[PDB]
Design a protein around this ligand. Structure first.
Ligand SMILES: NC(=O)c1ccc[n+]([C@@H]2O[C@H](COP(=O)([O-])OP(=O)(O)OC[C@H]3O[C@@H](n4cnc5c(N)ncnc54)[C@H](OP(=O)(O)O)[C@@H]3O)[C@@H](O)[C@H]2O)c1
Ligand SMILES: NC(=O)c1ccc[n+]([C@@H]2O[C@H](COP(=O)([O-])OP(=O)(O)OC[C@H]3O[C@@H](n4cnc5c(N)ncnc54)[C@H](O)[C@@H]3O)[C@@H](O)[C@H]2O)c1
Lengths: 319, 319
């Protein structure tokens, strides 16, 4: 069984989900469908992943076959950077709602505390790093709170059940908590033994914000920007600390990395194209790491970040 | 001799100043007076330091003697944490103007991106960590931008020439730049070889924001406060890298530590607590560090932070 986490919004969120990043458009539907059959109920998507239409197909098929009801599926989407200007927030949320073929998303997160110049959905979707002027980055002067209030209105309109943020450092999250009416229910950040950010996790959890981790396998996880940084990093799967703990419990390094977060109340969203791993990625809660295990793993924290906007255009999010 | 820096506001600011933190009230006036006779023109103060009245006495004395005119002195003050609510900003500034005995302050910075619950000036001043409920910390929901607008108003009212922020991480400064009419002219942060944050510096400077470093001597300032972290840290004055470079140019480690910041366009406000130091700390621009030198000093960066709100009450400002 996959334990649930009660968000500050009152809604329940599965502690384990299926990452949808990089899911091929041609197979995304079938894969989400199979994941549902395998037991997954939460799917972590994003407008920027360009496959929400297909993720929706998979979900619709599971429902149409009577496998699950909409009420049983937890869908997470994220507002891309070009859509921070309040007047563009609803239009972006609608495109997401249509693509997924649903009336509301369970969780809608501000993907990045970065506001790109608006680009019409018809001109290019998803825009990625395109800002309307060739390969140049162009930003909009839209404070985070403006975008957040827009999201709050959308929750009142019944189009979103819970809202949160992603890739938000501590100072920024704090300032948002000051002007927010609906408190961020979730903070989704890169989280693994090489980037533990223990103080950020503790602050958030105490503030009642739930943590959703991504790139749980560190460099073993998928890395698109500065692939070199990840390739030149000693894998966690082969790290002696992880290897020893894994051997000790007769578990795979992957199970140890996912449990390391789960046992600490952090939600995970692994992604696998292999059916065997798919099942393992949701069946790892069969053991508990000890105090010593946690101490040994804690020594790995070196602040190594693989998803950094500083690589995009020297955006100071993490400095 | 002391180079000026033209701020984004159009006003000049001495690149070398006199720090007023932990400047005893009993002799603050005399010391400020002496600093002025020694050539200092910028004084970095703060409501929290609780010595602005004395600082004011020293400036007034120098003025009454005809040593300087108000316009030649550059006075920096900082809005303490209990006064972030817009309705209390001008109140706090008036207290500063009344103690300094001036019509305006040259620079007024948001001391910290932290908002303590308001405490009437008549109940306790300065409040320090007092938040109106015993030894408990209490906060108020006041977004940074709200405080910034109150300040922008005061600039238009002629009470402040330039405004800026202190202890702001990159993400927070970026967001502020999104909603600010008057761009923060200054970013004052802890800056020394053990905490270089080169990316924050680069971003700020490229954004036209002027950097003022504080605690240029690392742990020294905090050792004098009996802080465990600083006491356990090897001093920069006795560090092999600093001494080697100092010897190379026949300069003192102190001079190398200040030049290291000054050469990269960073303003310094060293705490001179001895006559000899008054002179030393304003006459270091007598040599240039080479690329090799910077690369050597660069190796000391280990992210060691001495002034951290996380120590007060786990405030996630730098996490
Ligand atoms: N908000 C954000 O900024 C952000 C950023 C990145 C990701 N995310 C989200 O979080 C999810 C996690 O990121 P991710 O997909 O890169 O990482 P991941 O789900 O941890 O998977 C990364 C890699 O590990 C392999 N893998 C998966 N399960 C495994 C297992 N049990 N044993 C061994 N290898 C295994 C996969 O290969 P195979 O598929 O071949 O098995 C894949 O190459 C994403 O799908 C996305 O939804 C959010
Ligand atoms: N905004 C903020 O959060 C913040 C925090 C701390 C300090 N500040 C400001 O910046 C100033 C400088 O920082 P600081 O006071 O913490 O430390 P500093 O690095 O300026 O000096 C610290 C100590 O080192 C010694 N020192 C000074 N000059 C020396 C020399 N030539 N040779 C040998 N030792 C020397 C003195 O004993 C002094 O107390 C403060 O006075 C204050 O105005 C601002």
């Amino acid at each position: 069984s996959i334990p649930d986490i009660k968000l500050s919004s009152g809604h329940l969120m599965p502690s384990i989900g299926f990452g949808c990043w990089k899911l091929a458009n041609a197979t995304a539907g079938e894969q989400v469908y199979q994941a549902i059959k395998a037991g997954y109920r939460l799917f972590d998507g994003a407008e920027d992943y360009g496959n929400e239409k297909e993720v929706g197909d998979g979900v619709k098929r599971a429902i149409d076959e009577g496998l699950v009801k909409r009420e049983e599926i937890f869908l997470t989407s994220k507002l891309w950077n070009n859509y921070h200007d309040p007047k563009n927030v609803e239009t972006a949320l609608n495109k997401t709602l249509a693509d997924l073929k649903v009336d509301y998303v369970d969780l809608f997160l501000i993907h990045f505390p970065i506001a790109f110049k608006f680009v019409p959905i018809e001109e290019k979707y998803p825009p990625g790093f395109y800002c309307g002027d060739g390969n140049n980055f162009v930003y909009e002067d839209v404070p985070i709170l403006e975008t957040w209030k827009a999201l709050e209105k959308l929750v009142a309109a019944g189009k979103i059940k819970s809202i949160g943020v992603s890739n938000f450092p501590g100072a920024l999250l704090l300032d948002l908590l000051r002007g927010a009416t609906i408190k961020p229910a979730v903070l989704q950040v890169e989280h693994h033994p090489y980037l533990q950010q223990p103080k950020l996790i503790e602050f958030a959890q105490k503030a009642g914000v739930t943590i959703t981790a991504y790139s749980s396998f560190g460099p073993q996880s998928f890395v698109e920007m500065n692939q070199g940084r990840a390739l030149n990093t000693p894998t966690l799967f082969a790290h002696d600390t992880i290897k020893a703990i894994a051997a000790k419990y007769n578990k795979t390094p992957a199970e140890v990395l996912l449990r390391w977060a789960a046992q600490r109340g952090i939600a995970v969203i692994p992604r696998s194209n292999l059916p065997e791993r798919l099942v393992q990625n949701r069946s790892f809660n069969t053991f508990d790491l000890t105090k010593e295990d946690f101490e040994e793993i804690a020594k790995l924290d070196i602040g190594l970040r693989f998803n950094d906007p500083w690589d995009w255009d020297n955006i100071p999010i993490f400095v």
